[PDB]
Symmetry: D2
């Protein structure tokens, strides 16, 4: 069903366990992958596992010009995956960086009348969690819907994946897992799976949606 052959995807925060699960899956589905992030050493070990059809981009999203530059550095771009990511610090990383990445990617994707943007919110935390992470996640979803409407006639979809708890002392766990009906934490591959679907041609009529991958913890 899901074939990403011929596509080029860019994954930010590609050395996190979610970032890397996404990178492997999209690569395994035939996408050429641009794995981006600040830890060159970890990106390279990801790269080694990928073997070919990837490129590393050592990048600090915290810097606005570097977000802006990251996308230009790329010629083909069909799929952008923005991983997460002081109130100000979380907002600037989880929301302002992502705006730039999304906007710049849109400018590129408009030229082809094709593209996929998937914004991934950080892992809970934390029912609604700390104000900063909760504000930035919501903000990112509001951002996603808004850009979705804006690029809709031009063949670009913009969607969000909201992971719940992805893999403490036995007290802290009890606490969380009790908020997850399924009764367990998710794994990075659970998020990767949702992302690959939204990044594919089989989700061409899905835009502005947030897809929660959370074990029933939040039902929307």
């Amino acid at each position: 069903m899901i074939d990403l052959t011929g596509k080029t995807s860019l994954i930010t925060g590609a050395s996190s366990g979610i970032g890397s699960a996404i990178a492997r899956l999209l690569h395994k589905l035939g996408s050429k992958v641009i794995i981006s992030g600040s830890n060159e050493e970890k990106l390279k070990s990801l790269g080694n596992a990928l073997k070919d059809n990837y490129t590393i981009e050592v990048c600090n999203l915290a810097n606005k010009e570097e977000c802006s530059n990251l996308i230009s550095k790329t010629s083909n771009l069909d799929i952008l995956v923005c991983n997460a990511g002081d109130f100000d610090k979380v907002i600037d990383i989880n929301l302002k960086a992502n705006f730039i990445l999304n906007r710049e990617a849109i400018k590129k994707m408009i030229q082809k009348r094709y593209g996929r943007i998937i914004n991934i919110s950080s892992i809970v935390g934390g029912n609604p969690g700390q104000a900063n992470y909760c504000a930035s996640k919501a903000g990112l979803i509001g951002m996603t819907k808004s850009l979705s409407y804006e690029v809709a006639t031009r063949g670009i979809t913009v969607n969000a994946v909201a992971p719940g708890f992805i893999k403490l002392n036995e007290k802290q766990r009890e606490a969380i897992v009790q908020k997850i009906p399924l009764g367990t934490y998710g794994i990075p591959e659970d998020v990767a799976y949702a992302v690959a679907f939204l990044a594919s041609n089989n989700a061409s009529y899905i835009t502005g949606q947030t897809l929660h991958v959370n074990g029933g913890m939040l039902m929307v």
Copy 2:
């Protein structure tokens, strides 16, 4: 990725555009498909096109004993897809919501034993639109509420319960509309274009997969951005 080899899926409403698209896709992905519905000739043609790995089940949702009989008479049911019986308030509530609750309850009866299942409820297509007649709107919201509550309650027993909510899906060569009507609907849709049945089918397949395991009680909107949840 979405390999349904050795699985059995039951699709109600299998003769509608969405229904038959779901039937073919789930079959293409390796699943036996119990293709169910009221028009038998329509259902035989689909069957004929499917060729193998199906069973027809002529069936009338309206009959409450016949919904309950539908699920108990299938043996290994891994995946249930309830299509909407929808284009009287009581009537549409009865087919789109009550009917679907027997199907859902009866499927969980079978699935809880096997500790594995997928239930996927599909709301009725948006009409000529988005809030709709009260009765369709009620049943649809209702379906989605039902889907959350069943999701919660089987969530520890390896069954996911999810819904798909299509927008304006074009199933037919002609939609029966004139240009003004058409423009009026297409103005509701950011993508500036209709859904087709395969759009909904792809979403259903995604949820039906083994890898959709951590995804439950969600509504996947396939609607060209006309409604963002």
Copy 3:
């Protein structure tokens, strides 16, 4: 601010804790109150406490002709408050959703002429919780969907349609629960405390006001933060 002088309000379920709290508040604010329900003695006591500006309407929601008869038999109806008949899937769907649709349709019949109305649908209280049994969950989601669709359709004709969704409301001297049960429910509620009927009544009064004119098709959750929409 919320002056209901010269208005008439009909409250179904007027003998429940929430119902009678709504009845007293809307009366206190100057509205005649058509206090309706099935237990007459309960309803007479409330009436006795109300003293003036009410009418009792013994009535059985279950009867579809009796819901329709309820609204047509009241003359100047400005405000309708439908309380939930809720503590069979079919049954709860029939009282909490179908019943409420006749009431709502029949009220809009009267209100559209006067080009002014308030309709306020109240979902059933959360049970011992939040997603609930499927049947209550379905009807509640369903009610809220109905409320949006009717809201849209009378929105140009000076009628607002809104819902109130309470959480755990304590109405009775004792709740029937033991401490473990109580702690389990109170753990669901950020405020760490129960709703009381007046909480829901205040929300209803807010929506019923002349100044709630631009507010329609909303669900006002009065639930101590247990669910945030």
Copy 4:
């Protein structure tokens, strides 16, 4: 029903038409009002209309220390009303300023185990509108829910009012009003009314909610 006698409320952006409608209403309901904002001249003309039981605080929210200072300057505070308010500019004004105001107000309100915080999102724009306003509005609501959960046992409620279109060429209007079932724009008094309710004792069991005052334009 709604009596604010004995209370002190602080309204930011108090010289906007929404801000001032809120200030008058809360004052008319018996609240002492602290009317805050950057336009001293306009605040003073608001002040004159109020006549007594108010105080002006000339304040630029754009400055973080000034947000932090605004609340300390106040001894009694039962009710805070945060009016809205470069991607970065809108986020910083409509979301970062509000965080500080909310957090500082919470520190004060914890001491009394009482308080009301109402965050008001900017007027549409714009179905979801520009990405910056849509992101900041969503962010503010996510922020509101998160702080709601955090202060809930301490007698403070935190809620959001989301106005729709509040009072172009005849083309632009046609466009908007078509998105509003009611078929008309709202007035500032419509927002003021919602705020007074949430700010009162009659909304003591309502927290973490967003209340949309929009003519049915968005139903939630």
